[PDB]
């Protein structure tokens, strides 16, 4: 109602992070196994865009590029300084190999 379609999951690398613009929100879109994982891509701290930064799959966070703070995929929540806020993450469901994202 409607949620937005941004790639088929093997267009994905696993551990790959992408960013695609979801209703106007740029978000951070990761593979890791076959689950997929959804946050703004718009680092906390100050001005950066996350899928730059570096994938960490044991971890699952994904690494800032710019002061390296770190966030966990599965739920925005800040794991590293200087990143102290959370950010949003995205309801995301794989459906038929869809990668479905619900919109803020
Ligand atoms: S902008 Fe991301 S840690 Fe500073």
Known sequence: ST????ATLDQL???????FDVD?????????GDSVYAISNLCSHAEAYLDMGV???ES????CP???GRFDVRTGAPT???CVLPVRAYDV?????????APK
């Open 55 to 57: 994938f960490h799959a």
């Open 24 to 32: 106007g929100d740029e978000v951070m879109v990761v593979r890791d």
């Open 13 to 19: 690398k696993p551990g790959v992070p992408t960013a």
């Open 80 to 82: 590293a300084l200087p």
């Open 60 to 63: 699952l966070e994904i690494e």
């Open 3 to 6: 949620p937005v379609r941004v």
């Open 66 to 68: 710019l002061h390296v």
């Open 93 to 101: 469901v794989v459906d038929g190999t869809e990668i479905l994202v």
